[PDB]
């Protein structure tokens, strides 16, 4: 249920919710093949007392690295008014997830003058040059650039 | 600066220091006052920059100023990437790139 | 000024007239001709390569607008200008490397 | 000979600034001193700020409330700025409370008020409402230090709660002239000005206390060697 | 100048120090700074150059931590460039590993 | 650098039969637990986890250290084979 | 969200003392590809020295 | 935030490193960058100041009899280390005078009330038999660093100034990390090394180093 605690009833994250690498947006079900359980499967589940169940988690998570707060979803299938998708498909669902980009240690910067360059540090303020009425510089660009 | 001379506060110590140093460099006439010199740094470009690590001057005036300086859309968070083992390829049974 | 406005990406005032309504969704605007136009805004639209296309409104109820006047800024337009990034305080000077 | 113990000024303007001298001093502790007190002074002296946000009919911070010009992400924004002084001392987190409508443009006053609790900025612009426009927020602003992220500390109240920027530190700037002195005999001794600005929940002298106080506190650690 | 003979400087003969900690302790306190050249006595010895270069020096003494090896593979009389440079970790390659 | 590689490059004739003779003693220790290690309790390479200092697992920071002391033999066609991937197994089994 | 922070105790335990192996765009020479004693670091970039 | 430990590795009386881990982002610079100023400004040591040599007139001289010249002995003078051990003593003359063929050494400086010669084998002078040497030093308590030129003090006509070594801190270095305790990782780590003449040492430097430093905290207390 942990697994399962940002989604509706039928299988859809919330609108807004915080969704992270491994977590399923969508739920969804397939029927398993000529691999239903083998003998070295059925039987430990013989000692589970759970017997082969005959559906698999095909369910659609967040891939490494992204993430962020459900924004909106579409949910378009077919029997219910406006649509017809592609044959032999009953539903399709989009669901599209924002993220806040504060600026990063790797993110590219630029000016209009073809300056470029990666940050490569972030500094506190206490350590950013600063002029004698005491306001800190935003932006340390090297020379050796010109 | 003239915002500063009259609320309670004149030239400073590290600024003669780097003034000092600005003459031998020969950006700034020798033989005038600290504000007279300070603004021919500043007709410059160049101010007085103090190294927050120690608040001892930069041996030298600085370049300070304000840049139009955009973000560009190649960001470290679209392109880390790394497997350990993963999807093949059919017939050459090599990893999907 | 020109690119926001070809770019056809921030929105202005087809008329004059005045501001009846506003607010993060539409701009109703009551214009000489009697006619109450309303501009809605398209906020927070998802772009080909993901950068949030969102339109924001840049005037209140009761402003008196001549024809040609800004109602709405684009992305990257701040009041009609075209704002690709940020100025900021810049120091000229090796930093240890980094 | 060694210099005795030099003369302690101070200039207090208001709750926000404040000049705090130092003379004589033996030359080159100027910044000996000036210096390590300013890092203090923007990193580590306590303060308050806006922790997390629910606001009514709303679940993520990409929203938008109709009648109200302001979308979330700017309100939010706005709420960032709001300075917000505890008087109790062992007070540790507030919930403000605001609700408004019709065409009122809410500042920072109209949020209501709490005893233990001043807006040191009632005039911070808020929202823009018109003819219809509905508002119902509840801010959480917290004692807190330094610089701590929304992706960082994940407080919500409610559930559709807004984790907010905290720039908990109440410092606004340091600065800190050096100028030449002398007690008669000697020459090139140090004139320490020390600048404070402030938003007001501490104060340019309390943080100046602070401050030496915990630079008094890490010289401590100096005590027990291996 | 020309004084008494051989060419020196003012500074060669104000400042004088018997090891290279002073020198660089007068640095410390405003009295010279490292691009002055100056009368020191580093190694036996007396040297007329610049506590900067004194400074180098120590850098490559301490940390090949042979201060004897390190005095004959630098060459002081000069400012480091890139070719002295590049000439010095060859030297330093083939001598120390 | 590597602690100690330039007197490491002076015991081989090629740098190459280094690399093998360390790989080889490298996993002579993997499998086996150390146990037929040459060093003693001091000379250990040691990691220094949260907890406190243990034993470095990287067999091949050992197998390096171990070729500095002397204590092993590095040259072709010293033993049968098999004769030594027992003798090794009995006298420190795994 | 299930890693819990004694993993990456746990991982800085794992790489001691091995190397790992940078390569640059353009592998002009043997030297488009060198290693290195790989520190960890929160943030996504890598360091190069 | 845990006790921050603090370690110390000592050769013997001339040199100290002392490491202060884990610290809060930024500290290890806050911190002994000013010990860095103040253990430069503020030890207080001694240090010859003048000196007097029978036929010798100005400081750029050669002496007949003595292989050394004028300043070589100034140098080696500038080198001497001595301490003061009455806590009241804040000035010392000290005398020598030998001749024939010696070299002479700080052993051979006549001996004094409370007056400790630290380095006696320091090397002074050697004289060719003809070669006299009579010679008188001034050395007193002190801090810091003062050219010769600026403290000018003269005892008689021709004694010569010379540039004033008080520090017996020699140099000061530190070297703040990068570090990490558990999930927190951006705390300092703060290594400080410490070369003194022996006259005070490393360790002791440091502490009177810190105490000048809560000393100075303090004069935050009486306003107007
Ligand atoms: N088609 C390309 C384009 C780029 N590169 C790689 O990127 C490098 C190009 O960067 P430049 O700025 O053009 O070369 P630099 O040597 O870095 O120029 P500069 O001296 O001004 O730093 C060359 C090459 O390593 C490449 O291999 N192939």
Same mark, same amino acid.
């Given at each position: 249920?942990?697994?399962?605690?940002?989604?509706?009833?039928?299988?859809?994250?919330?609108?807004?919710?915080?969704?992270?690498?491994?977590?399923?947006? @969508?739920?969804?079900?397939?029927?398993?093949?000529?691999?239903?359980?083998?003998?070295?499967?059925?039987?430990?589940?013989?000692?589970?007392?759970?017997?082969?169940?005959? @559906?698999?988690?095909?369910?659609?998570?967040?891939?490494?690295?992204?993430?962020?707060?459900?924004?909106?979803?579409?949910?378009?299938?077919?029997?219910?008014?406006?649509?017809?998708?592609?044959? +032999?498909?009953?539903?399709?669902?989009?669901?599209?997830?924002?993220?806040?980009?504060?600026?990063?240690?790797?993110?590219?910067?630029?000016?209009?003058?073809?300056?470029?360059?990666?940050?490569?540090?972030?500094?506190?303020?206490?350590?950013?040059?600063?002029?004698?009425?005491?306001?800190?510089?935003?932006?340390?660009?090297?020379?050796?650039?010109? | 600066?003239?915002?500063?001379?009259?609320?309670?506060?004149?030239?400073?110590?590290?600024?003669?220091?780097?003034?000092?140093?600005?003459?031998?460099?020969?950006?700034?006439?020798?033989?005038?006052?600290?504000?007279?010199?300070?603004?021919?740094?500043?007709?410059?470009?160049?101010?007085?920059?103090?190294?927050?690590?120690?608040?001892?001057?930069?041996?030298?005036?600085? !370049?300070?100023?304000?840049?139009?300086?955009?973000?560009?859309?190649?960001?470290?968070?679209?392109?880390?990437?790394?497997?350990?083992?993963?999807?093949?390829?059919?017939?050459?049974?090599?990893?999907?790139? | 000024?020109? !690119?926001?406005?070809?770019?056809?990406?921030?929105? *202005?005032?087809?008329?004059?007239?005045?501001?009846?309504?506003?607010?993060?969704?539409?701009?109703?605007?009551?214009?000489?001709?009697?006619?109450?136009? /309303?501009?809605?805004?398209?906020?927070?639209?998802?772009?080909?390569?993901?950068?949030?296309?969102?339109?924001?409104?840049?005037?209140?109820?009761?402003?008196?607008?001549?024809?040609?006047?800004?109602?709405?800024?684009?992305?990257?337009?701040? %009041?009609?200008?075209?704002?690709?990034?940020?100025?900021?305080?810049?120091?000229?000077?090796?930093?240890?490397? *980094? | 000979?060694?210099?005795?113990?030099?003369?302690?000024? $101070?200039?207090?303007?208001?709750?926000?600034?404040?000049?705090?001298?130092?003379?004589?001093?033996?030359?080159?502790? +100027?910044?000996?001193?000036?210096?390590?007190?300013?890092?203090? &002074?923007?990193?580590?002296?306590?303060?308050?700020?806006?922790?997390?946000? *629910?606001?009514?009919?709303?679940?993520?911070?990409?929203?938008?409330?109709?009648?109200?010009?302001?979308?979330?992400?700017?309100?939010?924004? %706005?709420?960032?700025?709001?300075?917000?002084?505890?008087?109790?001392?062992?007070?540790?987190?507030?919930?403000?409370?605001?609700?408004?409508?019709?065409?009122?443009?809410?500042?920072?006053?109209?949020?209501?008020?709490?005893?233990? $609790?001043?807006?040191?900025?009632?005039?911070?612009?808020?929202?823009?409402?018109?003819?219809?426009?509905?508002?119902?927020?509840?801010?959480? $602003?917290?004692?807190?230090?330094?610089?701590?992220?929304?992706?960082?500390?994940?407080?919500?109240?409610?559930? %559709?709660?807004?984790?907010?920027?905290?720039?908990?530190?109440?410092?606004?700037?340091?600065?800190?002239?050096?100028?030449?002195?002398?007690?008669?005999?000697?020459?090139?001794?140090?004139?320490?000005?020390?600048?404070?600005?402030?938003?007001?929940?501490?104060?340019?002298?309390?943080?100046?206390?602070?401050?030496?106080?915990?630079?008094?506190?890490?010289?401590?650690?100096?005590?027990?060697?291996? | 100048?020309?004084?008494?003979?051989?060419?020196?400087?003012?500074?060669?003969?104000?400042?004088?120090?018997?090891?290279?900690?002073?020198?660089?302790?007068? @640095?410390?306190?405003?009295?010279?700074?490292?691009?002055?050249?100056?009368?020191?006595?580093?190694?036996?010895?007396?040297?007329?150059?610049?506590?900067?270069?004194? &400074?180098?020096?120590?850098?490559?003494?301490?940390?090949?931590?042979?201060?004897?090896?390190?005095? /004959?593979?630098?060459?002081?009389?000069?400012?480091?460039?890139?070719?002295?440079?590049?000439?010095?970790?060859?030297?330093?390659?083939?001598?120390?590993? | 650098?590597?602690?100690?590689?330039?007197? &490491?490059?002076?015991?081989?004739?090629?740098?190459?039969?280094?690399?093998?003779?360390?790989?080889?003693?490298?996993?002579?220790?993997?499998?086996?637990?150390?146990?037929?290690? $040459?060093?003693?309790?001091?000379?250990?390479?040691?990691?220094?986890?949260? /907890?406190?200092?243990?034993?470095?697992?990287?067999?091949?920071?050992?197998?390096?250290?171990?070729?500095?002391?002397?204590?092993?033999?590095?040259?072709?066609?010293?033993?049968? /084979?098999?004769?030594?991937?027992?003798?090794?197994?009995?006298?420190?089994?795994? | 969200?299930?890693?819990?922070?004694? @993993?990456?105790?746990?991982?800085?335990?794992?790489?001691?003392?091995?190397?790992?192996?940078?390569?640059?765009?353009?592998?002009?020479?043997?030297?488009?590809?060198?290693?290195?004693?790989?520190?960890?670091?929160?943030?996504?970039?890598?360091?190069?020295?």
């Amino acid at each position: 249920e942990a697994a399962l605690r940002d989604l509706d009833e039928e299988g859809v994250v919330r609108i807004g919710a915080e969704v992270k690498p491994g977590d399923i947006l @969508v739920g969804r079900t397939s029927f398993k093949g000529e691999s239903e359980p083998t003998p070295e499967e059925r039987l430990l589940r013989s000692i589970f007392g759970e017997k082969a169940r005959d @559906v698999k988690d095909t369910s659609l998570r967040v891939p490494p690295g992204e993430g962020g707060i459900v924004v909106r979803t579409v949910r378009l299938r077919r029997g219910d008014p406006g649509v017809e998708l592609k044959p +032999g498909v009953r539903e399709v669902v989009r669901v599209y997830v924002a993220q806040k980009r504060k600026l990063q240690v790797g993110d590219k910067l630029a000016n209009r003058h073809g300056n470029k360059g990666v940050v490569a540090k972030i500094l506190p303020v206490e350590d950013m040059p600063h002029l004698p009425d005491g306001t800190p510089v935003d932006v340390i660009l090297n020379p050796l650039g010109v | 600066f003239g915002k500063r001379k009259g609320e309670g506060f004149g030239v400073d110590k590290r600024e003669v220091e780097v003034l000092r140093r600005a003459e031998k460099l020969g950006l700034v006439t020798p033989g005038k006052t600290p504000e007279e010199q300070l603004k021919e740094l500043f007709l410059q470009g160049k101010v007085v920059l103090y190294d927050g690590r120690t608040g001892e001057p930069i041996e030298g005036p600085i !370049v300070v100023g304000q840049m139009f300086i955009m973000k560009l859309y190649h960001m470290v968070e679209d392109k880390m990437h790394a497997r350990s083992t993963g999807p093949y390829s059919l017939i050459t049974q090599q990893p999907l790139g | 000024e020109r !690119v926001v406005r070809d770019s056809l990406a921030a929105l *202005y005032a087809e008329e004059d007239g005045e501001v009846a309504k506003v607010d993060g969704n539409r701009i109703v605007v009551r214009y000489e001709d009697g006619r109450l136009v /309303e501009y809605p805004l398209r906020r927070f639209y998802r772009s080909n390569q993901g950068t949030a296309l969102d339109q924001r409104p840049r005037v209140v109820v009761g402003q008196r607008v001549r024809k040609g006047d800004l109602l709405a800024d684009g992305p990257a337009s701040e %009041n009609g200008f075209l704002a690709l990034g940020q100025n900021v305080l810049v120091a000229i000077m090796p930093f240890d490397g *980094y | 000979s060694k210099l005795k113990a030099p003369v302690f000024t $101070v200039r207090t303007q208001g709750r926000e600034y404040g000049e705090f001298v130092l003379e004589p001093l033996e030359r080159g502790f +100027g910044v000996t001193l000036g210096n390590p007190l300013r890092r203090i &002074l923007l990193s580590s002296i306590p303060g308050t700020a806006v922790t997390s946000v *629910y606001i009514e009919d709303v679940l993520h911070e990409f929203s938008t409330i109709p009648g109200v010009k302001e979308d979330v992400v700017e309100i939010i924004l %706005n709420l960032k700025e709001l300075v917000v002084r505890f008087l109790n001392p062992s007070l540790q987190t507030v919930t403000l409370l605001l609700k408004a409508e019709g065409p009122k443009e809410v500042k920072a006053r109209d949020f209501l008020p709490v005893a233990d $609790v001043e807006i040191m900025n009632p005039d911070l612009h808020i929202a823009t409402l018109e003819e219809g426009g509905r508002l119902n927020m509840e801010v959480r $602003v917290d004692r807190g230090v330094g610089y701590v992220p929304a992706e960082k500390h994940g407080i919500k109240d409610r559930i %559709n709660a807004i984790p907010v920027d905290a720039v908990f530190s109440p410092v606004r700037r340091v600065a800190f002239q050096v100028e030449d002195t002398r007690l008669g005999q000697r020459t090139d001794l140090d004139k320490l000005t020390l600048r404070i600005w402030t938003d007001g929940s501490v104060t340019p002298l309390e943080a100046l206390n602070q401050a030496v106080e915990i630079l008094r506190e890490h010289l401590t650690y100096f005590s027990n060697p291996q | 100048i020309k004084v008494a003979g051989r060419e020196t400087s003012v500074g060669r003969l104000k400042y004088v120090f018997a090891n290279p900690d002073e020198a660089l302790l007068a @640095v410390a306190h405003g009295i010279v700074d490292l691009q002055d050249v100056v009368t020191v006595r580093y190694m036996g010895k007396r040297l007329e150059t610049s506590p900067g270069r004194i &400074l180098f020096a120590r850098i490559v003494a301490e940390a090949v931590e042979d201060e004897k090896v390190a005095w /004959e593979l630098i060459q002081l009389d000069v400012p480091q460039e890139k070719n002295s440079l590049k000439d010095l970790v060859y030297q330093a390659f083939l001598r120390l590993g | 650098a590597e602690p100690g590689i330039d007197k &490491l490059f002076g015991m081989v004739d090629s740098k190459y039969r280094l690399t093998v003779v360390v790989a080889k003693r490298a996993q002579q220790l993997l499998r086996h637990g150390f146990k037929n290690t $040459v060093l003693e309790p001091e000379e250990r390479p040691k990691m220094q986890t949260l /907890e406190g200092l243990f034993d470095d697992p990287n067999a091949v920071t050992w197998a390096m250290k171990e070729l500095l002391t002397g204590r092993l033999v590095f040259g072709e066609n010293l033993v049968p /084979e098999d004769r030594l991937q027992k003798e090794m197994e009995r006298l420190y089994p795994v | 969200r299930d890693i819990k922070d004694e @993993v990456w105790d746990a991982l800085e335990e794992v790489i001691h003392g091995k190397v790992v192996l940078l390569n640059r765009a353009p592998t002009l020479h043997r030297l488009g590809i060198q290693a290195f004693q790989p520190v960890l670091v929160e943030g996504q970039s890598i360091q190069l020295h």
